[PDB]
């Protein structure tokens, strides 16, 4: 009963990041807790970003990401 993860569009992530610029509304009260409780996982996100850094013979590098 396992189907794999659904492979969202890139713009779906991109709208979310843009939306969370000015978190002044009352709707962002849960998502502010999500930013703050993700701070412990942030050293793992730095290692996975820096290990996948493009080597000098590469113009660009599409990486597969997982996002909240």
């Amino acid at each position: 009963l396992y189907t794999p993860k659904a492979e969202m569009p890139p713009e779906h992530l991109r709208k979310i990041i843009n939306t969370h610029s000015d978190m002044a509304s009352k709707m962002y009260n849960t998502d502010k807790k999500a930013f703050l409780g993700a701070l412990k996982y942030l050293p793992h996100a730095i290692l996975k970003l820096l290990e996948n850094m493009p080597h000098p013979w590469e113009q660009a590098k599409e990486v597969k990401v997982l996002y909240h």
């Binding site: 991109r14 843009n18 000098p56 013979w57 590469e58 113009q59 660009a60 590098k61 599409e62």
Partner: protein
Amino acid sequence: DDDEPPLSYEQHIENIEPLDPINLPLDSQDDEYVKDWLYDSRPLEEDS
């Protein structure tokens, strides 16, 4: 500068042609077996 925010990927970066990277020219008569695939992202990824 630390006052300016990290500028967005799409309004600034995504629209431009990137650049040439560091690639050795790979002389064709001495390097004919590698010059087609040496500087790929994942070299020979789809070669079964």
